Design a protein around this ligand. Structure first.
Ligand code: ATP
Ligand code: CA
Ligand code: CA
Ligand code: CA
Lengths: 125, 358
């Protein structure tokens, strides 16, 4: 029922969202591959299966300086998206500087890092 | 704003969803001569009978638990519970009837508009930014190993060890008395708990440390008592938490936490074991001992195939990991429809919790 869940994995391709203050916000398609190191992202790769179905790989990417609420949310969103896709996604934790070969493979001009990002959603006690 | 309450055997951790920490942390104790809760119950213990409504992570006294919850809402958080969706936590393998009871009380006694119950160990894994791993959760009353894959615990592989903080406090009391001091009374128990939390650590190699302790004074520490007297603690510093690895120290035939962790992993599907070894997450107050992570890394390495990638994760905030995971979960835009509502409870009754809350 979340707008972005409805849009997730409808066709082959790559979808990227950024965790922004406890919400999943779509990343502009022109900005794909440029990751803020202070933020966390959810990445869904959808592949056409010969069987007509779609193959799903969910990757949650964690920037070196992302806050606990962002890394926590990215993980939970991953579980929820996977559940939404009837459990059929394979889940991958991707840490800045240690990303898997297949994840790095998604970005044809190579992925790049940039310092900064959106502020934490947490209220400080 | 939603509320998050994490009820343990020894401590209640409560607060507001979206906060980075619980605003209320207090002893899970109810005293009766018409009732006192927490710290105020402890200070007046000479004139009342104290009871712990939660034993080994499981609620066993529902009358007293209601008082804990009432005190949490009104005295600690100062909220009208009827205004706030409330997330509660539960132990691994919490009986079905207990889950239903929890639900019944929240809607029927406190009249919350919405509620949810989550497994404590799963919330801690989420707090570490993980969907797959094995949690070692050790508090005041109980220790669990909980393997989790793609967001969900594997019930068949969960291990329970009835040895935690309380036993370690009592043991440190015994070995300090054996050293030459006398820690025996309920007031002396509270002092020893502070020594435990301040001076104890886990030795990387226990026998080597026992040799260093007997030949030198380099491992000795001084502690000032409330009366002003200064005492010296030696090998007791590391002998106390060694009990976690060698439960025979208190006359228990159970395997140590390193062996239960291995055993838990080995009960899981062979295809996920690598992910488990690489994601050992520690949570709870009893995992706070300096050196515990380094020792677990060493012990699991000795148990596993030599080529296995092993990683122990011990966040500084792991006393409150369960609570923080709950705070994050309840704050998510996607969590809004996941709550059990008052309407849904009225339609379906308490059994709704088994369908809405894994
Ligand atoms: N720095 C520390 N070092 C060692 N032990 C600690 C430290 N801080 C707290 N503890 C111990 O941790 C215990 C409380 O932790 P926690 O709140 O996780 O338990 P709980 O949730 O009440 O109990 P359980 O999870 O067993 O039901 C107490 O026994 C306390 O003495
Ligand atoms: Ca950020
Ligand atoms: Ca899946
Ligand atoms: Ca606990």
């Amino acid at each position: 029922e979340h707008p972005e869940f409805l849009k997730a994995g409808k066709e082959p391709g790559l979808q990227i969202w950024r965790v922004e203050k406890f919400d999943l916000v779509p990343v502009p398609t022109n900005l794909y591959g440029d990751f803020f190191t202070g933020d966390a992202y959810v990445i869904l790769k959808t592949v056409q299966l010969r069987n007509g179905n779609l193959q799903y790989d969910l990757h949650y990417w964690l920037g070196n300086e992302c806050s606990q609420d962002e890394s926590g949310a990215a993980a939970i969103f991953t579980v929820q998206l996977d559940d939404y896709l009837n459990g059929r996604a394979v889940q991958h934790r991707e840490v800045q500087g240690f990303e898997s070969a297949t994840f790095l493979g998604y970005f044809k001009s190579g992925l790049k890092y940039k310092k900064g990002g959106v502020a934490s959603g947490f209220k400080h006690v | 704003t939603a509320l998050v309450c994490d009820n343990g055997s020894g401590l209640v951790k409560a607060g507001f969803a979206g906060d980075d920490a619980p605003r209320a942390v207090f002893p899970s104790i109810v005293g009766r001569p018409d009732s006192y809760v927490g710290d105020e119950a402890q200070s007046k213990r000479g004139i009342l009978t104290l009871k712990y409504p939660i034993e080994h992570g499981i609620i066993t006294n529902w009358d007293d638990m209601e008082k804990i919850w009432h005190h949490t809402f009104y005295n600690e958080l100062r909220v009208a519970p009827e205004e706030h969706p409330t997330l509660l936590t539960e132990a691994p393998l919490n009986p079905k009837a207990n889950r239903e009871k929890m639900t019944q009380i929240m809607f029927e006694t406190f009249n919350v508009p919405a509620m949810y119950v989550a497994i404590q160990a799963v919330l801690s894994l989420y707090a570490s930014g993980r969907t797959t791993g094995i949690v070692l959760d050790s508090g005041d009353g109980v220790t669990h190993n909980v393997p989790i894959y793609e967001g969900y615990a594997l019930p068949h592989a969960i291990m329970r060890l009835d040895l935690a903080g309380r036993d370690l406090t009592d043991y440190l009391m015994k070995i300090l008395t054996e050293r030459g001091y006398s820690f025996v009374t309920t007031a002396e128990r509270e002092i020893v708990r502070d020594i435990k939390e301040k001076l104890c650590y886990v030795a990387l190699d226990f026998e080597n440390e026992m040799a260093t302790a007997a030949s030198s004074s380099s491992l000795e520490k001084s502690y000032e008592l409330p009366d002003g007297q200064v005492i010296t603690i030696g090998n007791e510093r590391f002998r106390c938490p060694e009990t976690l690895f060698q439960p025979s120290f208190i006359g228990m035939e159970s395997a140590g936490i390193h062996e239960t962790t291995y055993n838990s992993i080995m009960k899981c599907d062979i295809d996920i074991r690598k992910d488990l070894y690489a994601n050992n997450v520690m949570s709870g107050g009893t995992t706070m001992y300096p050196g515990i992570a380094d020792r677990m890394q060493k012990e699991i390495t000795a148990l596993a195939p030599s080529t296995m990638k092993i990683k122990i994760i011990a966040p500084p905030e792991r006393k409150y990991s369960v609570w923080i995971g709950g705070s994050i979960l309840a704050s998510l835009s996607t969590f809004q429809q996941m709550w059990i509502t008052k309407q849904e409870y009225d339609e379906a009754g308490p059994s709704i919790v088994h369908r809405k809350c894994f």
